[PDB]
Symmetry: C4
Subunit: 201 residues, 4 copies
């Protein structure tokens, strides 16, 4: 129902957005991109996700988000085949993020402070002077910078609208100091991914 505080919320908040756009005299293409983002991202409803989750117990918090990430976990070998407690620990630190076609999720050469899991959408991995590798539902990227603490080893550009979950470097490390055999699984893959664009260490 539209009388749901959560749909009425979406409408009022989108109203705020329109006036901000109007105050700053944003171009029409930029206004359309935002409108479209707002629909893909929120889908007519706004929740105070983390305050609602925050009001619950941790087991319910865990149970809920496991339920929500069922396809993501089962599509992703790293997750699907791991200890659930590690999986849960990751899952509860993730932040949902949407991107639009054309967006540079990551720029090569920059400093990186999050990695990403692809729930839905297709993305492009772009190195200066290699062909282009694609990643879709059930893969992740942006992990290399977190392991090395250097710079981004590629740009990553959205082909489609993307529904992603991001993980901060501090959470990534926190989960890996508690689950160290999982560090290796990211390393193996990260080396393989470097090898192929002809790089090392």
């Amino acid at each position: 129902s539209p009388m749901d505080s959560s749909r009425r919320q979406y409408q009022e908040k989108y109203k705020q957005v329109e006036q901000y756009m109007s105050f700053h005299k944003l171009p029409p293409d930029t206004r359309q991109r935002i409108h479209d983002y707002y629909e893909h991202r929120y889908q007519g409803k706004m929740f105070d996700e983390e305050s609602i989750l925050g009001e619950l117990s941790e087991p319910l918090r865990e149970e809920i988000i496991n339920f929500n990430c069922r396809k993501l976990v089962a599509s992703m070998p790293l997750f699907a085949n791991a200890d659930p407690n590690f999986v849960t620990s990751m899952l509860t630190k993730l932040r949902f993020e949407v991107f639009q076609p054309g967006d540079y999720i990551i720029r090569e050469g920059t400093i990186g402070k999050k990695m990403y899991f692809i729930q839905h959408g297709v993305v492009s991995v772009l190195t200066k002077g290699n062909k282009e590798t694609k990643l879709a539902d059930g893969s992740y990227f942006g992990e290399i910078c977190l392991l090395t603490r250097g710079r981004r080893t590629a740009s990553v550009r959205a082909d489609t609208y993307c529904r992603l979950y991001s993980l901060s470097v501090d959470n990534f490390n926190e989960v890996l100091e508690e689950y160290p055999m999982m560090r290796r699984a990211f390393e193996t893959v990260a080396l393989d991914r470097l090898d192929r664009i002809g790089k090392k260490n």
Copy 2:
């Protein structure tokens, strides 16, 4: 009265919860668990507890929560027989938490960042290959990890609905750097509890 902003609040916030459940298409058992949590936890009323407490002076803050924790303090030798200022200092750092039958309050082997005091309810302490010890009103658990900085030495599972107060590791230490003879009282007991599931140090 239901016209009390605090009952009207409970109703509106529970409405939010229902719509969140609906958006994410949660199973019925999971919806019932949450409904039931919400009733045991809040009891038809929501307060901004720490903002109301935050608006008061510290002595009133102290007086109030002492009043509220009277049965807890008097049921618990560690508290009942201590210096009230230490007791007050602990009490003002606690966070109320509810759990449901079946919940793993603590999982063995994980990293722990809070201990717990049992105001109401009964819990089960579960070590791989020992019998099962029970704890109820007036005991605490989860202190061992805080003292050692290692991992959880047992799982702890709720038998009943549990009304608990949690204490973070940083607060635990803060209160113990100011009240060091109380460190010992946790140590003595913590050693005794290790002894019995056949462990050490």
Copy 3:
């Protein structure tokens, strides 16, 4: 006017308080103490002081609070005779606090993380085995712990309702690392105050 959002606010928020008191079944003396605090502290009006101040420029922020602390600054030699920029720097870090007759603003032997300036009210300084010194409008206390980093050297108990400004240890140090000749003025006095209850260093 009572239609002022700030008086209507005081009334609604005090309503919240009454229901909290009712939920937790607070004794009548404790309910009266809180009622009375709420009137002395807020005086029928609630402002989001720091959000309103936060929306302004720093010079206006500074100008305002200087205006408000005029009697305090001019009653207090340390402030009255200092560099205004130091005074301003202190003033902008203060937090208004009210206390009631009987309250222990400070307990001897505890760890201290704020000092206090007396705008209005009279207080009692109590050392085990000395007579009792009184402080009123235009003095400060609780500075000794901040200078030494040891424990409280006295209890301090409110005789009257007290209108005070508190300063955290971190702000105290921040202002003193920038204004080091003012450190001395607190030291001189702090030594004199120790001398008299027969203590040192």
Copy 4:
């Protein structure tokens, strides 16, 4: 429209301000200065700028503020001629601030934790015993303290109403650890500016 939640917001919030002024019995000149600030700063509309921006993706966040800072970037050689990614990185860390004629944006001799970019307005740089240098649209100041970590090397006083963007020292460094050749461009200029008021290092 005035029915826009953002204009209604400005009106309600300005109402709050008036009552605060009234409670604290502010002088008329001080009330007029604030009224006038509120109009130059907000212009009849209040947005939750960073919450709206916070709800969007980073690329949209970036695109928007680039659009908004177009004249600032193109008026300022340091920005205009740099790598956009550095520019974007700076731009997204800026905080809009307004000042009034007469205001001391910076006092010589104090500790500094932000620098400033002038979008609109004219300012005065004042050293004890030199003539006075003026800066307007398209310059910046307050960078010297950030580079040296010493004290302010001048007072800076607003001649006109000023629309400025501030950058905190921590953000300044963060952007410069990632873009180190830009450190030099601030150094060169900062040395030149010292030279001229007859100073060094």
